[PDB]
Write an enzyme that holds these catalytic residues in place. Structure first.
Site, mmCIF file in Angstrom:
data_model
loop_
_atom_site.group_PDB
_atom_site.id
_atom_site.type_symbol
_atom_site.label_atom_id
_atom_site.label_comp_id
_atom_site.label_asym_id
_atom_site.label_seq_id
_atom_site.Cartn_x
_atom_site.Cartn_y
_atom_site.Cartn_z
ATOM 1 N N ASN A 1 0.903 -1.264 0.331
ATOM 2 C CA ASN A 1 0.163 0.073 -0.136
ATOM 3 C C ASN A 1 0.798 1.264 -0.179
ATOM 4 N N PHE B 1 6.472 3.205 17.700
ATOM 5 C CA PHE B 1 5.096 2.602 16.064
ATOM 6 C C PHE B 1 4.396 2.744 14.865
ATOM 7 N N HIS C 1 -2.914 -12.742 7.543
ATOM 8 C CA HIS C 1 -1.530 -11.912 8.212
ATOM 9 C C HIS C 1 -2.186 -10.442 8.990
ATOM 10 N N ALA D 1 -5.636 -9.469 3.549
ATOM 11 C CA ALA D 1 -5.144 -10.592 3.902
ATOM 12 C C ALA D 1 -5.879 -11.113 5.841
ATOM 13 C CB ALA D 1 -3.626 -11.054 4.025
ATOM 14 N N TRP E 1 4.899 -7.915 8.897
ATOM 15 C CA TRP E 1 5.908 -8.516 8.403
ATOM 16 C C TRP E 1 7.360 -8.553 8.341
ATOM 17 N N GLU E 2 8.358 -8.427 8.396
ATOM 18 C CA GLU E 2 10.132 -7.850 8.480
ATOM 19 C C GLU E 2 10.191 -6.606 9.248
ATOM 20 N N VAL F 1 1.631 -0.026 7.173
ATOM 21 C CA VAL F 1 0.338 -0.611 7.025
ATOM 22 C C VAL F 1 -0.535 -1.637 6.914
ATOM 23 N N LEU F 2 -1.192 -2.301 7.820
ATOM 24 C CA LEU F 2 -1.861 -2.684 7.461
ATOM 25 C C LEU F 2 -3.589 -2.580 7.670
#
Lengths: 161, 161, 161, 161, 161
Positions: free
Chosen positions: C23, C113, C88, C85, C57-58, C80-81
């Site tokens: 994104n 964060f 995930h 998914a 993830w990384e 960004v989440l």
């Protein structure tokens, strides 16, 4: 390419087994299946170490000790939880799984999860007692493969040294 | 600004592959996906390491081994999880993600999450046959980027020392 | 009483930025907000460190190395989440939250964060307008503040010794 | 068995890019995609060749000359077709697809097709801004494989001699 | 990066023009449009070659002659198709665009498509009086840039030799 994996021969191996007493009807059934698959898959039973503890909660603490013996190559978790106790089921379930996982990473010694979580006694008495899905059978076997696996990992670990 | 990232050449790198067996019709296309994506992004395959383990659970205990060898730059976690058991899937799921995440912070080496969770065997059929989305391809590539990135970070962390 | 705190000046300070790509539209939006507040509130832009990785993830394993050089003082997580998914989202958000947390504990160096979990595109638009809600703006502000905070503490840890 | 295929290293290769000016708002986004995927895949951008032509029609005739330089290995066609004029879209699309085909047959040198026929400007905004379906990105990737491929066909073309 | 592109000076150049006569009220406008955009963009007009043929069909055979002369640098197609009848329009339209396409890829000399297909004479009356859309002007322009492009490309095609 290097391929590591474990065959299923139980030759030359010493196992740990940690067993609860709560719901002894089906657990006692499970350990039976574990011992059997051990011996018939080529292993001798005098190296089976069976440790009994009252309920699910204490499973972790015991295995942690069994693994710090030098001569237990892998350890077999065995217990059952069935949603009879509602406040404790949440915390005993997530934590035992969690503690077992942390034990193995730490000690670098495979611990396998032979715990039935069966949502009722009807799902419990049909698996452990009627169907060959002898949960102890399979966790036992997976651990055998792990034992030979770290035999693969650590046998090459000394050839390089 | 100091910009870092990974270009995508797989030259001179050594990789880790941990593989489950469960639903091998799917896992094995993923493994193929990792191996191919490597060598076709420049790598050679004698320095890939292939380990096979029973089910999703043992993934961490094994991968933690691959990261304590020196000659592995990044490890690619490969397993599949499909809703078979309500008791097993939840706990072991959050546990593999956990154990993988923690090992990565610790051993100072990337671990990628090439684990299908396809809510059916059929949503795994749509991921491998309907679109390029062979997850072993994509997470393995991410791993290449992480290895060259950490090589970027540690080569400059060799010039200022 | 001894009162410790951080002013909001960005001079003498060297920063970390860990930046996903997934994104990109939204993330470029945020990184602009980050380097904006930094160089405005007293910093140069030459000792900002901008590291890019594929996805959320990384974010951990990367930031973990960034705060391990000597010269990077506070690190600005950026990612960004958005509930695309489904595995995930739950596990990759639970463990990055927990993960970045435990890093900052261990390294004794402030990691903030700046990962939005905006449940849709329209929370992605009211933050992506210049209406201050650019989460990188505020998060980068917090770590500037924490930056001079650990200056106040680590320097006072020098006068006592 | 003799398998011939191209890996993806962009090492030492020299490329052709032919880019129109029509609808350039999105075309420019393509060329960005191509240059990136090259360099990130190990290439250096001095050996990129960028040619500009007015509309779609000229794309073949020019590209044909580019591949008749000795120092160009593969050529990336880049242009945009959106149903503007009836004579334009029908005849120019059919002859570009045929033209670029014949040129690659004759010259014995690969020419890949990075022309979008997105039937609206909004199907190109959904090709570019909502996915990483950067048409030139992947047409470039296919070209890299083609160059390594004719590297394969032409390197074995000199060992048999 | 090397960018070849056509500036617009028509100095030193020599051109080919091939003109049908049919619907002469409008073609005459187009032909004038070409002569203009040559002479006013610096060209001298004694080196313009103007060839007239009856109808649409004979355009290709003629251009093939003009492009085989050594001293013509680019050829302008000029012809008009109007749905006077469905029997001739479908096949003659596909064939000229085709025949032209092959003429240029083959002889390696830019050929432009200065053919209006206006669905009525009133789309040709709107093309010529409502907006500067003098198609002969426009394709003549493209021919200029192509001529100067091949000038660029072929010039470098002699400095390397």
């Amino acid at each position: 390419m290097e391929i590591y994996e474990g065959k299923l021969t139980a030759e030359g191996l010493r196992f740990g087994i940690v067993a609860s007493r709560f719901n002894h009807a089906l657990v006692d059934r499970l350990v039976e299946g574990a011992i059997d698959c051990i011996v018939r898959h080529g292993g001798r039973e005098e190296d089976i170490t069976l440790v009994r503890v009252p309920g699910s909660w204490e499973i972790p603490v015991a295995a942690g000790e069994l693994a710090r013996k030098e001569d237990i190559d892998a350890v077999i978790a065995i217990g059952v939880l069935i949603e009879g106790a509602e406040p404790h089921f949440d915390y005993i379930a997530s934590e035992v799984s969690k503690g077992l996982a942390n034990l193995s990473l730490e000690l670098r010694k495979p611990i396998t999860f032979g715990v039935i979580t069966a949502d009722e006694l009807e799902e419990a008495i049909e698996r452990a007692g009627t169907k060959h899905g002898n949960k102890g059978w399979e966790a036992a076997l997976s651990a055998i493969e792990m034992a030979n696996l770290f035999k693969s990992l650590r046998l090459e670990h000394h050839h390089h040294h």
